[PDB]
Design a protein around this ligand. Structure first.
Ligand SMILES: Cc1n[nH]c2ccc(-c3cncc(OC[C@@H](N)Cc4c[nH]c5ccccc45)c3)cc12
Lengths: 317, 10
């Protein structure tokens, strides 16, 4: 058993919709982690208990360099909690905001590592459904760490389908904005939105009203900056094909179509997953408590079964 | 800026 007070609560990394992630230290080993702290009341109140359960099951059965690995999960008389590897580098949305845009090559690095994680997830019959900049953290070495498995769905092999209207509005695939069911190709759409943002420096579709936003996703053709390379334009045009069947990654071969697209011609997919490739950026941290790649907005704050039968967990590593 | 986003589930 692992206890709330096995952990120092050092710095508030993130807080909101989800819950509260805090940079902690393990009192025993002195190791550093990010601990997502959820209130059981909030979860039950909202029916979305199966998501907070599925998140645990997925973090327990997935192992990949570009997925956040779970160290321990447990609960208390009031709260569900996950302890996960800490990504010192912040998230890409933070870096992108500052940089405004990445180079194609830099976008290709993060893209390849995402294509890597998603191929792996799809191989395990998991659909992630929430690919967005905000969920893409960087670790201490500048490698992608996918984060927030709330909306995942298991059991999704090949042409199996899903029905939950979920995801993040700006990132929704068109098919998800129609009635009935959709498949795993929503993740490739999602990949296209983050890649477009990386290379073009904005979302391909945006309105602050969701009805207009949804209209844009369903009805508007993407635009590309003139200077974007033909290979980049092609990649984006494939991933953000509105028809999932015409979409790059939408065929029966899933990730293989994306991996074999010419944008990725220079990638050795074995070297990616084996992190042999030199990152384009490594976050410069002085200490373990150096939270410069998180908003001072959030960090400068102070801080204080039947249903969850399959939630608790401890790692072999 | 480009505002932040928040996932949902109907
Ligand atoms: C920062 C970090 N290191 N390891 C992990 C694992 C898991 C999370 C995590 C858990 N749950 C939700 C998350 O959400 C990502 C975004 N939806 C919200 C967000 C935006 N900026 C930050 C910064 C720190 C935590 C969350 C968020 C992430 C964060 C980290």
């Amino acid at each position: 058993k692992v206890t709330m007070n096995d952990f120092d609560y050092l710095k508030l990394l993130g807080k909101g919709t989800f819950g509260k992630v805090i940079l902690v230290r393990e009192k025993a080993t002195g190791r550093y982690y990010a601990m997502k702290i959820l209130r059981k009341e909030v979860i039950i109140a909202k029916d979305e208990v199966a998501h907070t359960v599925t998140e645990s099951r997925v973090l327990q059965n997935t192992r990949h360099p570009f997925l956040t690995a779970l160290k321990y999960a447990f609960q208390t008389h009031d709260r569900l909690c996950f302890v996960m590897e800490y990504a010192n580098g912040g998230e890409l949305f933070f870096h992108l905001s500052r940089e405004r845009v990445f180079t194609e090559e830099r976008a290709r690095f993060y893209g390849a590592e995402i294509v890597s994680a998603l191929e792996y997830l799809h191989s395990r019959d998991v659909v992630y459904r929430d690919i967005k900049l905000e969920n893409l953290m960087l670790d201490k070495d500048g490698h992608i760490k996918i984060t927030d498995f709330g909306l995942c769905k298991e059991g999704i092999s090949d042409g199996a389908t899903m029905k939950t209207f979920c995801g993040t509005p700006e990132y929704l695939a068109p098919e998800v904005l129609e009635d009935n069911d959709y498949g795993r190709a929503v993740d490739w759409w999602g990949l296209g939105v983050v890649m477009y943002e990386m290379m073009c420096g904005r979302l391909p579709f945006y309105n602050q009203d969701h009805e207009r936003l949804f209209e844009l996703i369903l009805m508007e053709e993407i635009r590309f900056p003139r200077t974007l390379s033909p290979e980049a334009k092609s990649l984006l045009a494939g991933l953000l094909k509105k028809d999932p069947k015409q979409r790059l990654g939408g065929g029966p071969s899933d990730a293989k179509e994306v991996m074999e697209h010419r944008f990725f011609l220079s990638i050795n997919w074995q070297d990616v997953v084996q992190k042999k490739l030199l990152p384009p950026f490594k976050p410069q941290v002085t200490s373990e408590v150096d939270t410069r790649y998180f908003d001072d907005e959030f960090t400068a704050q102070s801080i204080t079964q039947e249903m969850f039968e399959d939630f608790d967990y401890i790692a072999d590593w | 800026g480009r505002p932040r986003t928040t996932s949902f589930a109907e």
